[PDB]
Structures are given as C-alpha cells and as structure tokens.
Design a protein around this ligand. Structure first.
Ligand SMILES: Cc1ncc(CNC(=O)c2cnc(CNS(=O)(=O)c3ccc(F)c(Cl)c3)cn2)s1
Ligand SMILES: N[C@@H](CCC(=O)O)C(=O)O
Lengths: 277, 257
C-alpha cells in the first residue's frame, strides 16, 4: 500500500502530456499512462505510456517525497474532471469514488456535491468562475443582467462555457434561465472557446478562473481579459480528491500547508503561471 | 446535548465589538461575553448564524481572554483562541483565523470561507515598493514596521531564517491588537502595518488617510477552527462550500467588506 494509484487529467499549465521518446520520460516529466481503445466496439485497449508535467505534477512529486509514497500515474478516459450522471460519477471524481484511484491530481475544482462522495485536500490553487471577453465590455459579471436575462436585448449576448464541469454545474443550480440559454453556446474545450472569442463568434466565455487567468496572461497582444480585472464568483480551489476516510488525508494537507509557508508554491506559481500580459 | 462554545476575536469588519445598552441588549447581533456582556456582529457573526441553522445547533459567543489569535510558545503551549479551543474553553473558532501548517497540526480547519492574503498598510504619503523594500529588508529604527503579536503573520516572519531580520525589528514593535496598530499608523509613529488584506484594504476604504501597498506578497485564507474530533467538520466545510457557490458568501462580502 506504499504504492498508490493516482488519476490525472490534462489541462495546461497544471497537467501537460507529451508523447514519449520513440525511451524514458526525461526532464521534469513523470511517466503517466493512458488507456487507449483498439476500436469502438471491443472494450479492448492498450496503455500507451506518456510523460506528464505541469503545476499539479510537481505538486504530486513534492508530496511524493515528503509523504514518502510511490505511485503510478494514469490519465482518466471515462469523462474528464467529473460529473454525476444518473447518480453515477465519472471523470477523475468517479475514479476515486469506485476505488480505482487512491487520489486525484489536477485542476479538480472543489465544490459541495463532490465533498459528499470524496475527501478534498486543502485548496492549493485559488480558482472559481470568471468571465473572459475580448474586448471592450461594461458587464459587471455573472450577476450582470445580460447573463441573467439575455433576451431582454435585441440581439442578446452570446456567451458559453465548456459543459460537464464545476462551472456549468454551478450556473445550472443558481441561474436556471441563464443555463438553458448557454447550451447553444457550449464549447467543446478551452481552445475552441478562445478561437470563438477572437473570431467574433462568441462574446464571453465563462470558465474556471485559474485557467482563464493563465490564458489571459499569455495572449498575443493582451486582448483576452477577465472582467472585474480578475473578479471571481464562487471562490474555491483545486484540491487532491481522496477516498472518503482516506488515511492519506493527514499529510497531504499538512505537507501542502508546509509548501505554502515554506515558499515552494511561489516557485511553481512563477514557474508555470508567470504571465506576459 | 450542550450548547457549542464559540470563541471570537475583535477584528472588523468580520467581528465588531460594542457595549450593551443600559437594558443589557444590543443587522444580526448576538450577546458575547468579553473582558462583561457585549455586542458582536459582522461577517463572521452572520456566518455563524448561517451555520447554526444549516446544522441546527445552539451556541454562546464569548471573546478570547488574552485577546490574541493563537501561537505556540515554549514554557510548548498555544495562546490566543487556539489554546482555548484545545483546552476545552471553546468548541469552535469562528473568526478570521488564518490556515497554516502549525495550527492545522493541532486543530481541524474547515474549507476556507475567505480567500485573501497579506499586504502592508501605511500612512498615505509614505512610499514603499512592497515587502521587498530596502526600508523593510534592511531595516532601521528610522522606519518602524510591525505586525500583531501572537498572530499568523508573526509565525510567518519567524519560521524562515532568511526573514530573521525583518522579524527582529518587528519583534520590538509588534502590537497587542490590530486596532492599536492601525491607528498607530495614523498617529505617524507606526510607519507600516503588515496584516491580512481583507482587513487592511477595507479600512483603507473607510479612512482615506491610509493606503495599502505592494498588493498581496503572500496568500492566506480564513477557516473555521475546530478540534480533531468535532463531529461538525464534515458539515461545516460542506456549508462553507455551499455558501461560496450560492453567491451567499458574496452577499456578506458586499455587506461587510
Ligand atoms: C493561482 C494560485 N493560487 C494559489 C497558489 C499557490 N498556493 C497558495 O497560494 C496557497 C496558500 N495558502 C494555502 C492554504 N491556506 S488556504 O486558506 O486553504 C488558501 C489560501 C489562499 C489560497 F489562494 C488558496 Cl488556493 C488556499 C494554500 N495554497 S497558485
Ligand atoms: N475545474 C473544473 C472544470 C472546468 C470548469 O468547469 O470550469 C472541475 O473540476 O470541474
């Protein structure tokens, strides 16, 4: 039990996956496998061996040293971060719920409905829900009327999100009319949403605050901005999702809290989230 | 089977402290016993009241005796609110208590109900670049800066040997409470106050003679204080997480902060 099964999900700059040397994972990368199907009828597949790096990856390494545990790393393939579908959890959350991963590492937002099924560590990356535009807006935020009641304009505002995450889960519970309006503007990923913003097809992109602040700081020409100059709704953070009652809950937080007072979270903050804009 | 004993500390805008009227009574106000029945209200009090129904429990608020947050000093014992929670005088710390490593080793923090950080408060007209200003890095008794005694900021400057000198100049100038240090900056004998931004910049928004500088040089958060065995931890954290999502913590931030 000194060796743990750990699940992760790719989302720059926290978890970045690159193809391996056609032999080992070099530099600051850690070996991480990904179950890839053979075809779309058989359940048969193969674990392709890749290399993972980023903010949450080094966080895993620092905790791997201080807490003294070995691990294998694997990318989630049934979903992404996690969503309760027909009272069944998928994604990284589902991997911990059904005892296929001892802990989950990555840009895993801590919300209330997940803490009912898993145990979250201390938030080590502040995040939430922010709005990204490009550019020239006077909207206050999500509580701005234009998101609340879109059709009170002719034309209404065209804003969307990437579904099945903690962001869409929050807007559905809080704003029923806004949520059913955003469904036509749902983006398949963060890269598609940025393209839609700069091409004029999308007016605003509602997503995780930490990722938006990262993408806004690395924009060519400093055109993507988060409104409020960085305002965040439903403030929370990324957290290591563990089993409910996990005996590893006692050091991960104490060692993460150590990383804060030590001055090591600052390094990875200036290592991976240093912004040009 | 018993009322929960709530320990709080005077720290506006989170917790105000006012005296009872001649009738013995006092927005949502709760009678708090402090060094004497007093009146307490604010951010942390509304949050305590919101916790008390979500969980359906009765409580009694009383201020901390020594008037401190809590640090571990050698005779090792905890002072401030930390000691009262560990000794049994308290069952729950509802206050702007900073979550750090040393405190979490003994008590159980809930998920943070307030995300913020550390900044520097100065008298408007005094210019320092930030925490890395030469008047703070290489200090002199010409420029006086300090923090609050027996606080989390005091722990932050002493647990790193590189910050050993920034700490020693403060070691002689630290104050017993934040309120004394803030007005001391107005009287121009405290030149800089290093404290949490949730308190400093808010008071800079009400007293237009002080200004916060350098923005945040270190991030920290506020969590509910509980012992290792409090059977409310699971539900306190869930209530805080739910309070963050439903835009309700945001209501308190506009109401008080
Ligand atoms: C975008 C980024 N945010 C944070 C990064 C690096 N880590 C921290 O600053 C940090 C600081 N303190 C703690 C523990 N206390 S806490 O109250 O739980 C808390 C306070 C403020 C925070 F911001 C977060 Cl996340 C959590 C954890 N983490 S990088
Ligand atoms: N970080 C989110 C995914 C992105 C989002 O929904 O904003 C989660 O863990 O669910």
């Amino acid at each position: 039990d000194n060796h743990l099964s750990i699940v992760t999900l790719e989302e720059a700059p926290f978890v970045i996956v690159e193809d391996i040397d056609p032999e080992t994972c070099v530099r600051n990368t850690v070996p991480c496998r990904k179950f890839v199907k053979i075809n779309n009828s058989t359940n048969e597949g193969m674990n392709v061996k890749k290399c993972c790096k980023g903010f949450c990856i080094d966080i895993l390494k620092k905790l791997s040293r201080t807490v003294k545990f070995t691990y294998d790393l694997y990318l989630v393939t049934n979903g992404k971060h996690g969503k309760k579908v027909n009272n069944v959890w998928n994604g990284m959350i589902g991997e911990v719920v059904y005892q296929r991963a001892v802990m989950a590492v990555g840009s895993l937002t801590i919300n209330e409905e997940r803490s009912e099924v898993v145990d979250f560590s201390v938030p080590f990356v502040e995040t939430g829900i922010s709005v990204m535009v490009s550019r020239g807006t006077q909207v206050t935020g999500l509580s701005d009327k234009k998101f609340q009641r879109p059709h009170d304009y002719s034309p209404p505002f065209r804003f969307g999100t990437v579904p099945n995450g903690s962001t869409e889960r929050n807007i559905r519970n809080n704003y029923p009319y806004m949520h059913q309006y955003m469904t036509r503007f749902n983006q398949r990923g963060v890269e598609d949403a940025l393209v839609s913003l700069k091409t004029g097809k999308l007016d605003a992109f509602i997503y995780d605050a930490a990722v938006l602040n990262y993408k806004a700081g690395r924009d060519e020409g400093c055109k993507l901005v988060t409104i409020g100059s960085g305002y965040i709704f439903a403030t929370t953070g990324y957290g290591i999702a563990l089993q409910k009652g996990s005996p590893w809950k006692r050091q991960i937080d104490l060692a993460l809290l150590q990383f804060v007072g030590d001055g090591e979270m600052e390094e990875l903050e200036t290592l991976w989230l240093t912004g040009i804009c | 089977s018993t009322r929960l004993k709530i320990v709080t500390i005077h720290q506006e805008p989170f917790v105000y402290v006012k005296p009872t009227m001649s009738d013995g009574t006092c927005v949502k106000k709760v009678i708090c016993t402090g060094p004497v029945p007093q009146c307490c209200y604010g951010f942390c009090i509304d949050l305590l009241i919101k916790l008390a129904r979500t969980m359906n429990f009765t409580y009694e608020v009383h201020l901390v005796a020594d008037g401190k947050f809590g640090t571990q000093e050698r005779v090792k014992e905890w002072n401030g609110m930390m000691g009262e929670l560990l000794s049994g005088q308290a069952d729950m710390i509802v206050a702007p208590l900073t979550i750090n490593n040393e405190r979490a080793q003994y008590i159980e923090f809930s998920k943070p109900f307030k995300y913020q950080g550390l900044t520097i408060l100065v008298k408007k007209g005094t210019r320092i670049t930030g925490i890395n200003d030469p008047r703070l890095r290489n200090p002199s008794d010409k420029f006086i800066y300090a923090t609050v005694k027996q606080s989390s900021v005091d722990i932050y400057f002493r647990r790193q040997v590189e910050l050993s000198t920034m700490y020693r100049h403060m070691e002689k100038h630290n104050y017993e409470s934040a309120a004394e240090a803030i007005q001391a900056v107005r009287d121009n004998k405290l030149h800089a106050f290093i404290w949490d931004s949730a308190v400093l910049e808010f008071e800079a928004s009400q007293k237009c003679d002080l200004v916060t500088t350098g923005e945040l040089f270190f991030r920290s958060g506020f969590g509910i204080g509980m012992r290792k065995d409090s059977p409310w931890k699971q539900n306190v954290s869930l209530s805080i997480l739910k309070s963050h999502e439903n835009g309700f913590m945001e209501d308190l931030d506009k109401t008080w902060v």
